[PDB]
Design an enzyme around this catalytic site. Structure first.
Site, PDB file in Angstrom:
ATOM      1  N   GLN A  40      49.053  48.321  43.518  1.00  0.00           N
ATOM      2  CA  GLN A  40      49.496  49.171  42.414  1.00  0.00           C
ATOM      3  C   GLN A  40      48.292  49.956  41.902  1.00  0.00           C
ATOM      4  OE1 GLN A  40      52.370  50.966  40.503  1.00  0.00           O
ATOM      5  NE2 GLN A  40      52.887  49.060  41.567  1.00  0.00           N
ATOM      6  N   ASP A  72      51.663  39.768  43.447  1.00  0.00           N
ATOM      7  CA  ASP A  72      50.434  40.439  43.854  1.00  0.00           C
ATOM      8  C   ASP A  72      50.589  41.912  43.499  1.00  0.00           C
ATOM      9  OD1 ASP A  72      48.303  41.710  45.089  1.00  0.00           O
ATOM     10  OD2 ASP A  72      48.636  40.818  47.056  1.00  0.00           O
ATOM     11  N   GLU A 109      39.525  44.099  48.888  1.00  0.00           N
ATOM     12  CA  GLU A 109      39.502  42.969  49.857  1.00  0.00           C
ATOM     13  C   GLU A 109      38.708  41.801  49.259  1.00  0.00           C
ATOM     14  OE1 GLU A 109      38.040  44.567  53.562  1.00  0.00           O
ATOM     15  OE2 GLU A 109      39.654  46.053  53.689  1.00  0.00           O
ATOM     16  N   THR A 147      43.884  36.327  52.081  1.00  0.00           N
ATOM     17  CA  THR A 147      43.595  35.015  52.646  1.00  0.00           C
ATOM     18  C   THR A 147      44.240  33.910  51.821  1.00  0.00           C
ATOM     19  OG1 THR A 147      41.491  35.871  53.482  1.00  0.00           O
ATOM     20  CG2 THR A 147      41.768  33.479  53.418  1.00  0.00           C
ATOM     21  N   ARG A 169      66.875  46.559  54.026  1.00  0.00           N
ATOM     22  CA  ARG A 169      65.919  46.633  52.931  1.00  0.00           C
ATOM     23  C   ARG A 169      64.754  47.544  53.301  1.00  0.00           C
ATOM     24  NH1 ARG A 169      65.181  41.904  55.432  1.00  0.00           N
ATOM     25  NH2 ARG A 169      66.668  40.832  54.060  1.00  0.00           N
TER      26      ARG A 169
END
Ligand code: J40
Ligand code: Y01
Ligand code: Y01
Ligand code: YFW
Lengths: 336, 286, 57, 235
Positions: free
Chosen positions: D85, D81, D40, D45, D59
């Site tokens: 992962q 982003d 985080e 944001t 999908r």
């Protein structure tokens, strides 16, 4: 707890059994076999049309059509005989790291950083390729996928787990846990009853498809394994790792047989495969070239130089006619 | 005597054709060298190759024999190919400058609206100015004095054609390229200008090195272009207007003509044999 | 993390309980497979261009 | 050769190749950015901030990689982003070789906090290690980094209540927002070993709707201009 003691005792017992089974090195047995001689291969076809770094290819069972996957989000069904592009499937996610071509020739699978194994239906009633099924359930990047048959597919992803998928229902019929690191390759048996996975914990495991349990573990590499391929017999396989060394493991002997290394090679192997007879182990490298290895004698027979960038994928037709090597410079090359 | 100058012109011709052919081949056979800027550089190399295999040989034969021995028709065609290819080369330099200026000062145009069709349009436009400077002496604007001497080959010296050709071939390109490279210099300087003391000193040294590099590069480009063509187009403007009291020595005039001809040899050295991408491609070809 | 230890030790004992053969026999079988199929390996022995699909039709 | 089936196959191949050329031309007009950070770190944001006005130019949700396609001032941007992962980074970080820039987001307010894995590891130290690893990869030798320092207000409150010396023992100075925010920025700058090939564009994330994406656009245009100058030999 105290289970570490019996765990290491079992490891030592396994090592002792493997050492006891080792009486003659594969070099001593194959010393009498005459050298294969220099292997000269010239690029017959150069398939062009990709616009980014290829990451996978897979020959068909008719040994003529092949599929390739690249970062431009394109899954091209080539025709290696005439270089014609039979199909060009636009991928929903451009981050594709693997592809497979179904043995029946009807389906094609791909997957990558998106943790989804998309399956395309090539032969339909309207002549237009469309995503038949999207297999979700992996929590890491899907590194390899191989079609068990027209209805089942085995996928290996970076969540340390390999999975057996039922395409019709879309769920994991079986999951294969046990690897400590990211599984980076997967090779199906000729009889499709077993499959090995080379993972980033510097080990490879032999899995039973039906029972879903690890039959054997092969720990010979010093770094993560990037490629793996079953020897045509189905009783052995070869592994390619960033150790810059390829290794041959036998299932029945349950131990390493031969090491395919050279002092002039310091770059990791990105792809391995065998010829029809299993006597040539063709291994792609980060040195931009693929080195042909005589499997029985561990001699550098030939060199498939020509690629402008790193050779990511590599495969040999089922009839053994030709070897095609895709590379990061966006060119497939059939060598013959 | 004539053997030495013939050998010098021959080796100059050979170096020019070899360099231009190498650049064209490297661009043609390499897939990395297939962008708009490299297309413009390759078209410049092709034009210089045409200059070296269609103008240089006949100009060298004229220079060593000190007389034209090919005929009036072959002299007229030589002049036409002498003005067409060399004017095209100059406007290719100007087009490369324009492409660089657009790439540097307009990144949005570079990303969105930069296609090889632009490169083709610029090349066609540089050959168009070449044709419109080389063709007018074919029909009209040809005084009989040019044909009065069969044993000579000289560009039409009409005052109106002299002004038209000299401006549209060198001076409009020379002002255009100076303006474009001055704007590029301003953009580069603006980009360069914009323990803690050690990092500040390192930044200052690196900025000074970049300023030296950009001023050197612009000096090389503008200096070569000016030191090769300016000597020729100052004479090619003053001489025609000054019929008398401005005798031109043969040595100086020949050196000046061949200085401009050698601008075609020096173009691949600057625009092609200096950047990293061509050096790597040539190393891969070797 | 004790359950994972039990699973790992069970996996190790199951791996150790399998039957193994001598490496010489396995190498001999591999060398027999290679020599038996060496005739049908187009990469190993260059095939004439008459029947080579990637060079001459 | 001249058979009807072969003619049809060659025509199909030509049409497919034309479609691929069109798609590649379309894809070459899109600026690709790689968004990285630790948990985080406030990258969500940032993504939300850039998709307030401009977005997207059965999908199955993937959870592997996230696509963010936004257009700002006639420039197409594609933000990848890879925060979800959870695997070895070095096995797929080369897939992002050739992106225009790397947007790297670190929260300024997590200097006091520590990782949930172990108490004896500062979150800022983990972010610094990630920045050092990703800035000095062999794939990103020439790739510039757009550094975002999120949560400036929470950081100001925290340094008002708690000293910064806990995160940086060697730090020495009167505790206020400006000097501490400059010290953290300089510490992140000093991790860049490739000072000659790449530059770091550090911005303090603000609640203004356009300033963050405007800074990203300015950094990307300054990267493109500097690349064009380097190609011409003027940089
Ligand atoms: C008093 C104070 C200060 C001044 C005093 C001294 C210092 C300066 C003196 C004046 C300079 C003279 C020439 C210097 C050239 C020089 O340094 O060249 C460098 C070394 O390369 C080789 O050696 C490789 C050269 C290979 C050439 C081709 C070989 C074959 C030639 C014949 C060709 C035909 C047959 C093949 C390479 O280039 P570089 O270091 O000069 O730096 C740049 C160059 O200036 C930019 O122009 C170029 O941009 P582009 O031209 O716009 O594309 C850049 O890419 C880059 O190369
Ligand atoms: C027979 C001739 C036509 C052969 C080609 C010669 C050119 C390659 C020469 C002529 C003038 C030279 C330039 C003269 C002076 C300078 C400045 C020198 O130092 C500076 O950068 C300072 C510039 C300044 O102070 O204005 C760097 C090399 C450069 C550009 C030289 C580069 C090489 C040039 C272009
Ligand atoms: C920029 C780099 C590639 C160097 C370029 C050098 C050229 C400009 C030089 C090299 C050989 C020179 C030539 C060598 C000898 C002669 C013969 C010379 O003889 C004359 O006709 C005048 C004297 C006389 O009447 O005998 C005239 C100049 C000329 C053509 C020279 C012109 C200028 C040349 C082509
Ligand atoms: C008035 O004389 C001219 C006008 C335009 C020209 N363009 C090219 C040339 C000749 C170039 N070699 C003689 C060096 C030329 C001459």
């Amino acid at each position: 707890d105290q289970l570490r003691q019996e765990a290491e005792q079992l490891k030592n017992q396994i090592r002792d059994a493997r050492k006891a089974c080792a009486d003659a090195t594969l070099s001593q047995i194959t010393n009498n076999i005459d050298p294969v001689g220099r292997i000269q291969m010239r690029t017959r076809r150069t398939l062009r049309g990709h616009l980014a770094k290829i990451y996978a290819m897979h020959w068909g069972t008719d040994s003529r059509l092949l599929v390739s996957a690249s970062q431009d989000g394109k899954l091209i069904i080539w025709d290696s005989y005439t270089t014609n592009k039979v199909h060009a499937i636009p991928l929903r996610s451009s981050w594709v790291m693997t592809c497979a071509y179904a043995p029946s020739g009807n389906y094609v699978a791909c997957g990558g950083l998106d943790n989804i194994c998309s399956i395309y239906n090539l032969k339909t009633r309207e002549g237009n390729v469309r995503v038949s099924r999207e297999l979700a359930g992996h929590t890491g990047y899907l590194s390899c996928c191989r079609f068990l048959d027209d209805n089942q597919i085995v996928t290996s992803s970076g969540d340390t787990t390999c999975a057996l998928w039922d395409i019709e229902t879309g769920q994991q019929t079986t999951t294969f846990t046990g690897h400590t690191g990211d599984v980076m390759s997967l090779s199906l048996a000729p009889d499709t009853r077993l499959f090995v996975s080379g993972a980033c914990d510097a080990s490879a495991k032999l899995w039973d498809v039906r029972e879903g349990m690890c039959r054997q573990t092969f720990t010979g590499h010093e770094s993560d394994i990037n490629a793996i391929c079953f020897f045509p017999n189905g009783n052995a396989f070869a592994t390619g790792s960033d150790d810059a060394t390829c290794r041959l493991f036998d299932l029945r002997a349950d131990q390493e047989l031969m090491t395919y290394s050279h002092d002039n090679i310091i770059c990791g192997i990105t792809s391995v495969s065998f010829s029809k007879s299993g006597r040539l182990l063709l291994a792609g490298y980060d040195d931009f070239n693929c080195n042909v290895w005589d499997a029985l004698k561990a001699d550098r027979a030939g060199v498939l130089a020509g690629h402008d960038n790193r050779v990511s994928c590599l495969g040999v037709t089922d009839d053994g006619m030709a070897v095609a090597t895709g590379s990061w410079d966006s060119f497939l090359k059939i060598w013959n | 005597y004539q053997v030495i100058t013939s050998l010098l012109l021959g080796t100059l011709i050979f170096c020019a054709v070899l360099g231009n052919a190498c650049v064209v081949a490297a661009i043609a056979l390499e897939r990395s060298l297939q962008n708009v800027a490299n297309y413009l550089i390759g078209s410049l190399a092709v034009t210089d190759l045409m200059v070296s295999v269609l103008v240089l040989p006949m100009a060298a034969l004229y220079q060593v024999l000190n007389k034209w021995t090919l005929g009036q028709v072959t002299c007229d065609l030589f002049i036409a190919l002498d003005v067409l290819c060399c004017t095209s080369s100059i406007w290719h330099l100007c087009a490369i400058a324009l492409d660089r200026y657009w790439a540097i000062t307009d990144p949005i145009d570079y990303v969105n609206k930069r296609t090889p069709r632009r490169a083709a349009a610029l090349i066609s436009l540089t050959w168009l100015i070449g044709f419109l400077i080389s063709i007018p002496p074919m029909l009209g604007w040809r005084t009989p004095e040019d044909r009065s001497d069969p044993d000579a080959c000289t560009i039409s010296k009409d005052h109106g054609y002299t002004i038209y050709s000299t401006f549209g071939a060198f001076y409009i390109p020379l002002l255009l390229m100076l303006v474009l490279y001055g704007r590029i210099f301003r953009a580069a300087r603006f980009r360069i200008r914009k323990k803690n003391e050690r990092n500040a000193e390192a930044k200052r040294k690196m900025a000074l090195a970049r300023e030296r590099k950009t001023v050197k590069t612009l000096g090389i480009i503008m200096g070569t272009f000016i030191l090769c063509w300016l000597p020729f187009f100052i004479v090619a403007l003053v001489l025609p207007f000054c019929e008398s009291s401005c005798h031109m020595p043969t040595l100086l005039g020949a050196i000046i003509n061949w200085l401009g001809y050698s601008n075609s040899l020096l173009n691949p050295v600057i625009y092609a044999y200096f950047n990293k991408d061509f050096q790597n491609a040539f190393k891969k070809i070797i | 993390s004790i359950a994972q230890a039990r699973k790992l030790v069970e996996q190790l004992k199951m791996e150790a309980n399998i039957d193994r053969i001598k490496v010489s026999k396995a190498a001999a079988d591999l060398m027999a497979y290679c020599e038996a199929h060496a005739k049908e390996d187009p990469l190993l022995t260059p095939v004439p261009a008459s029947e080579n699909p990637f060079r001459e039709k | 050769t001249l058979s009807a089936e072969d003619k049809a196959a060659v025509e199909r191949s030509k049409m497919i190749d034309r479609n691929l050329r069109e798609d590649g031309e379309k894809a070459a007009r899109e600026v690709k950015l790689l968004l990285l950070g630790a948990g985080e770190s406030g990258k969500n944001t940032i993504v939300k901030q850039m998709k307030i006005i401009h977005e997207a130019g059965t999908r199955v949700k993937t959870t592997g990689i996230v696509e963010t396609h936004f257009t700002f001032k006639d420039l197409h941007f594609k933000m990848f982003d890879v925060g979800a992962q959870r695997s070895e980074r070095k096995k797929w970080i080369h897939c992002f070789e050739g992106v225009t820039a790397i947007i790297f987001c670190v929260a300024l307010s997590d200097y006091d906090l520590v990782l949930a894995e172990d108490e004896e590891m500062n979150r800022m130290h983990a972010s610094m290690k990630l920045f050092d690893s990703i800035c000095n990869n062999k794939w990103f030798t020439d790739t510039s980094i757009i550094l975002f320092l999120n949560k400036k207000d929470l950081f100001e409150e925290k340094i008002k209540k708690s000293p910064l010396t806990i995160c940086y023992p060697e730090y020495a100075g009167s505790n206020t927002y400006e000097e501490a925010a400059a010290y953290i920025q300089c510490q992140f700058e000093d991790l860049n070993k490739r000072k000659d090939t790449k530059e770091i564009y550090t911005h303090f994330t603000c609640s203004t709707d356009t300033k963050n994406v405007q800074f990203v656009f300015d950094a990307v245009t300054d990267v493109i201009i500097k690349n064009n100058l380097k190609d011409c030999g003027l940089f």
